[PDB]
Structure 1
Amino acid sequence: FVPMAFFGGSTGAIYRQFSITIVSAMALSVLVALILTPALCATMLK
């Protein structure tokens, strides 16, 4: 993902057309689904 930011010229930020969001939605998936999830597991389950 992110080391894709060391890209080229006209096919430039097209690899920054992500790897970043796929890190964002990943780091958000690793942070929001870290802080939350366990949160909404104790409340109402069974």
Structure 2
Amino acid sequence: AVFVPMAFFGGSTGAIYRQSITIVSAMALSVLVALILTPALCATMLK
């Protein structure tokens, strides 16, 4: 809600405040990795 709306850019500052989204594929993958897997690993093994 701060990143993708700021990627509603315009003009020669086109791919400038656009390539957020690059950030967010990464954020939603950090959520994915931390919703899959990290839950697993944590249980799988710690102490």
Where does the alignment leave 5 or more consecutive residues of structure 2 unmatched? Answer: none
Where does the alignment leave 5 or more consecutive residues of structure 1 unmatched? Answer: none
Where does residue 6 of structure 1 map in the other structure? Answer: 8
Percent identity reads 100
- Dislocated runs of 4+, deviation >6 Å: none
For 2:22 and 2:35, how far apart are their aligned partners in 1?
18
TM-score when normalising by structure 1: 0.78
1:6 to partner: Cα distance: 1.4
Q: Greater relative contact order (Cα 8 A, min sep 6): structure 1 or 2?
A: 1
TM-score when normalising by structure 2: 0.76
Q: Is the 8 A contact 2:7 2:18 kept in 1?
A: yes
Q: Is the 8 A contact 2:4 2:21 kept in 1?
A: yes
Cα offsets for 1:8-43 (capped at 9, x unmatched): 1101121112x1021111111111211110110111
